[PDB]
Amino acid sequence: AGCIKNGGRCNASAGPPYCCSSYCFQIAGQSYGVCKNR
Structure with a gap:
C-alpha cells in the first residue's frame, strides 16, 4: 500500500x-513507531 518516507x-x-x-x-509507552529513511 502507500507509505511515507x-x-x-x-x-x-x-x-x-x-x-x-x-x-x-x-x-515503549503508547505502542507507536515512526518510519524514516536508512
Missing part, C-alpha cells in the same frame, strides 16, 4: 508490516 507511521508491537523506507522508530 519523511514521517511514516508503524507499530512493531502490533505486527509491524513495512514502512516507506524500511525504517521505523517506536518507543
Whole structure:
C-alpha cells in the first residue's frame, strides 16, 4: 500500500508490516513507531 518516507507511521508491537523506507522508530509507552529513511 502507500507509505511515507519523511514521517511514516508503524507499530512493531502490533505486527509491524513495512514502512516507506524500511525504517521505523517506536518507543515503549503508547505502542507507536515512526518510519524514516536508512
